[PDB]
Ligand binder design. Sequence first.
Ligand code: NAD
Ligand code: NAD
Ligand code: NAD
Ligand code: NAD
Lengths: 321, 336, 321, 336
Amino acid sequence: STQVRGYDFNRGVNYRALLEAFGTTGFQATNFGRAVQQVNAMIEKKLEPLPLTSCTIFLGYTSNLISSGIRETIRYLVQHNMVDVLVTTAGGVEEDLIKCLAPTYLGEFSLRGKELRENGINRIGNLLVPNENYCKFEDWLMPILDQMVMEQNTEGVKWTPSKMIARLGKEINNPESVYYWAQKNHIPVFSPALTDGSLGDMIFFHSYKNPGLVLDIVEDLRLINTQAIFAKCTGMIILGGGVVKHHIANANLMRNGADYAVYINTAQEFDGSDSGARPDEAVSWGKIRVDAQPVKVYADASLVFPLLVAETFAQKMDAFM
Amino acid sequence: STQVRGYDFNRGVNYRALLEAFGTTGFQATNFGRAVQQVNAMIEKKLEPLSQDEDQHADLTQSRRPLTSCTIFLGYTSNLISSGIRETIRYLVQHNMVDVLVTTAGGVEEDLIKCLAPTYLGEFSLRGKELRENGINRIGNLLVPNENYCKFEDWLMPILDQMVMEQNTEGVKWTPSKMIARLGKEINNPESVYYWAQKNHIPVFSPALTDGSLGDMIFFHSYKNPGLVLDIVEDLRLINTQAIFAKCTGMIILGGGVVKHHIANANLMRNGADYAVYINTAQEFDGSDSGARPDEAVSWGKIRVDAQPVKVYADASLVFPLLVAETFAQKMDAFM
Amino acid sequence: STQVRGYDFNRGVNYRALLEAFGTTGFQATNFGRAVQQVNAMIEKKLEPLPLTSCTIFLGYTSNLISSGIRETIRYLVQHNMVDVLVTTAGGVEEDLIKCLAPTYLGEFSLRGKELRENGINRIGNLLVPNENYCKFEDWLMPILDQMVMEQNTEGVKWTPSKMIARLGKEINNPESVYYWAQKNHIPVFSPALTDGSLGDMIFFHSYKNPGLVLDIVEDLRLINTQAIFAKCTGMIILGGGVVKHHIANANLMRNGADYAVYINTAQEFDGSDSGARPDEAVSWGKIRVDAQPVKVYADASLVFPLLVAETFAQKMDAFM
Amino acid sequence: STQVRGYDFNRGVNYRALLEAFGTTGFQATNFGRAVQQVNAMIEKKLEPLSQDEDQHADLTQSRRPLTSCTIFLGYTSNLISSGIRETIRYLVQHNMVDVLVTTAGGVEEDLIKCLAPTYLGEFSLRGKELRENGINRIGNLLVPNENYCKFEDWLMPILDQMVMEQNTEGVKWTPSKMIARLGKEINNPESVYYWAQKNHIPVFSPALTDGSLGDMIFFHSYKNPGLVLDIVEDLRLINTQAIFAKCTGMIILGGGVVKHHIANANLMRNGADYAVYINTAQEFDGSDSGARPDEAVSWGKIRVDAQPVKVYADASLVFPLLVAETFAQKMDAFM
Ligand SMILES: NC(=O)c1ccc[n+]([C@@H]2O[C@H](COP(=O)([O-])OP(=O)(O)OC[C@H]3O[C@@H](n4cnc5c(N)ncnc54)[C@H](O)[C@@H]3O)[C@@H](O)[C@H]2O)c1
Ligand SMILES: NC(=O)c1ccc[n+]([C@@H]2O[C@H](COP(=O)([O-])OP(=O)(O)OC[C@H]3O[C@@H](n4cnc5c(N)ncnc54)[C@H](O)[C@@H]3O)[C@@H](O)[C@H]2O)c1
Ligand SMILES: NC(=O)c1ccc[n+]([C@@H]2O[C@H](COP(=O)([O-])OP(=O)(O)OC[C@H]3O[C@@H](n4cnc5c(N)ncnc54)[C@H](O)[C@@H]3O)[C@@H](O)[C@H]2O)c1
Ligand SMILES: NC(=O)c1ccc[n+]([C@@H]2O[C@H](COP(=O)([O-])OP(=O)(O)OC[C@H]3O[C@@H](n4cnc5c(N)ncnc54)[C@H](O)[C@@H]3O)[C@@H](O)[C@H]2O)c1
């Protein structure tokens, strides 16, 4: 039995101690402490001796988190081979690439769409992206799409979202890009509905100038499912809900459940959504092993993920080098 | 300037008047009243005759579905098909009241499986360990027996054998929408949303069709009968062209995620939808597309600047049947 | 075991049947069906033969619901003695009275406070109240406050929020007012923090012109607690959270739990709030009897309450006359 | 025009830099960065010397608390006192960093009871039937033994005897704030928020003080020793005058409900707070005051039009300690 007690600032300000005290603060602060423990357990397992490791970690995140600064946090983990599989939606891929061409700016949620549109600005929450960002994206992308169609028709290449994402990361060739690092470190990225964003727009426009590109999603299902099936252990770290959450969980259901699971999302369960489902619902399905101790932190990941990474993965920088 | 005033039950339980009074009740009841007006505007426009010039442009699509003055896109999350909203959606599709459907994997497969075995009411608090030990799967406060997926597997596998065969010998190029038309044809049951969708030439888009039970089956099946390819590129052209050659477009989206954005993005291609009604529980504070207000979509050009979009913040299991009752169901005659 | 099935519109449109089908629709539609059952059970119990009745029903609602049209729904129940005790916060009292003097208008959530203020308009969600409403309120209220101070000092009256609310309902003398009906039918209204609103503002200003008004909250605690203690049975219908929810639940804890409980609110549990607590938390405290089958509908009450009343209380208009 | 950019862990775990980087991270992390700036502006103003003219006006209150250039109101919901945020709040009050406290009943009593017996960590899913059978009470994912309230009763009853005695023989006129100062004096424990509040002349307002355990005790006690009166009218004058004669005011509100509105309403009396930071989980769609954005308060005049209010949409158990760490705790010296 642990007593409730928050950090005493009379000790002054030691950030490591402040974060550790969340565990005994209550509510989501406590779930955060539990998440720190579970992610550390995943890491300890991954570091256990038996490129396969003792724990295959699946990292999932929604598109908007890549628009946010969490893009740097994710790039760090991938850059240092701290996770093994990435799952994100379409915006999650393209905005990482576009950020290497032009920046995203801070704004406000209340900015009116009429005025923003008249000024050629697109709103993403309290962030802003100029139309010009997509124009630079198009110029950068078109010639790569041409090579892709050509390799497909003359070199037998059977594109899938994951193969395309590896290619784009390699093409962006910028150390700031999550996907540049992913393909460099052989970390696969799955995105079944990769056509649902600006990269879709471009593939669409491009098909009328150079028809034929095929993106198969069946081979990619085989690829992600086998990542979980042949794993010694698996851990799931999912920021947000939707396709990203279910696609990673369903892959783990194929091995009869994940050994560790930490979720950070704002969805609520009352609407029956998969996004808002507590990890306990996933246990009924077999997505999470019955003996696992899954953790869900109900919070905006822009606030929580950097702190979680600080108290876990960043503390093991050594082992990961 | 309308005054706030709720329905006065001293008038008795006059349901039509009760529902109309939501418009002046406030908060989400008022948003509901606005959604009703917007969906009715969508319907009024759809029933408008196509002029010679309009008809010329709208007919520029390959689809054999009869052109209308307002192409209505209906999107909904998987769980709503597990819920009884499955009957509400089937009704609209059965009577050609909407033109394009967009749903995620669970949204397709659960409609089919419901033709083989039912879904049951449960509780949100039921522990996963006990449910699993008892071969039961939880979806919110609903329950689905493991057995449901076994029946699905038996029904589906032979169809997948045929599809691969057709792909390799007849040169078929499968995409999620083509597969969903085929499955609906195969289920051949009037209680199925997709049976009616293919019968009425209403295309169904699902870019991440592999993310669910149907994906499980395709996966297992691929090991005995390898080779099935589901291209999502052709399907993007198909859904976008539906928006591009529309005289007018209306969007009715239940829930968020891929379903919401895929419809909005198709409409960005025509520079915005003319009408939009959203019913979802997501909030905007986390910067999610799901939780974004319609006004965010206006900045992108997904909703025309002159449109008067509406979002009802509520569980669609409660709101959608009421919305349909005050809009589409009132125009049943016109649709027959 | 009940199968999931929604209303089939091929039957055409029968509203009674449409509402009944919510029970088998799933998610909150089902909780709504359960709420209909529980409220009907309360009513059936109240109608059971033994002015005490076989079931004392406590109706609680937050201030904003009185700003909304739910004000008419509540007035109906009180007008016909369908509930026995009312609990609402300060805005919940004053806005009912003010609505008899000037109306509230529809607006939008996005209206900017700067412009609204420059125009003398106050925003409440997507509703609008002109400053002039409070001026009429002040004119109406001042002379009543004078009588109250006088009765207190010369007639021994010991004011409490509930006594004041009865007096104001009687003074507004308008059949449209919830409180006019409450005092007419001897339905007490509790509001411990009655000073937290415009009526507080007025009591404040008035005290400098005619000092001395005392509002005791201790006697009112005795009054509400004894309402639950001496009840044969009790049912709780609570719209929203906060003081309104806890004050009714705590009164029922004094009789070892309510027999029936139906909650309609948008609060979530993750932040540890009492507002967002599931009814099951209340069972741990003894606020709800262990054998009760409490129901919570996660939804905006402006949408749900009129429907609930239609399928329950309004269906028994006869018995209540 | 600031660009979006998150902290780069390649720089190592530099906590100060990590927290600063929240400002350019986006969504609520950015709102956090803004809250930090706003609370620091509040502090910077509070440390500003009072001019002769200012000092004259600010000294027009009866309170013996030393006038400052910015009167800061701190509000928080009951459950946050049950949580470890109780230590965060006690720290601020202990060092005179805030001037007025507003909390609900549970927010007062649980601080006192924590001096007699602890609160324990639990889980949200623990069933009420079993907990009750075991004499345990649940508060979110926290646990409080029935025994805690027994100890409270033993500690409190004698104090209530004295209070009634003082009321009847010494003519004391109790109000929630006076009772809370007395209870804090009585608990005489440096771990108590209220002990420090009364020691440092920081008034605590709670209009609905009867809504909790302390109300239970007053209720039971009234039957053996009848007569205790708690007037809420005097307390409204007291809290309003604190805002009216302030040179500047800042509002820091954790959670919503009475605590949020009571502070905002006091500030409406001076025509608005100069600074405002909110940290709550409520949403606006239901029209609630709790869920209202700061901009709604601007329409009322509760927040000055020129102010730049901030709301962080998050559980304060996670955010408040971080906020305090980057603001008040950095100025510890100045407050000693
Ligand atoms: N960034 C964008 O807004 C944008 C841009 C282009 C395309 N898209 C497309 O929109 C589609 C739907 O987006 P999605 O599925 O990635 O996610 P989403 O934005 O729809 O979010 C899904 C859910 O994840 C949770 N969530 C989101 N942000 C969170 C946060 N900061 N912290 C915690 N939980 C959070 C919420 O509960 C939310 O309802 C995608 O398929 C994608 O291709 C996204
Ligand atoms: N039925 C299921 O739970 C289930 C079953 C099998 C597979 N899946 C898979 O899960 C993946 C993610 O699911 P999804 O994208 O369909 O949506 P989702 O369940 O993740 O919900 C997305 C968002 O829509 C809103 N929403 C959901 N239910 C709502 C309701 N009742 N009323 C109003 N708004 C509501 C919420 O904001 C929610 O966060 C899908 O790709 C799908 O293939 C679903
Ligand atoms: N109407 C106003 O905005 C206003 C006006 C004057 C004074 N006040 C004062 O503000 C204080 C705090 O207000 P409160 O405690 O009455 O409530 P509130 O507005 O703070 O709401 C409390 C909670 O109730 C729930 N809720 C509110 N509206 C709901 C709805 N439509 N449907 C379902 N759940 C809903 C939400 O979870 C919300 O967080 C009160 O003490 C009151 O005197 C209110
Ligand atoms: N600790 C308790 O649960 C408890 C104990 C005894 C009595 N009470 C009584 O319950 C009544 C109502 O409680 P209340 O007014 O203190 O508030 P509350 O618990 O009802 O919460 C009000 C709102 O504040 C927000 N909120 C709550 N916790 C939050 C958090 N961790 N982070 C951010 N925002 C948060 C939420 O929007 C919530 O709906 C009080 O009058 C009090 O006397 C409380």
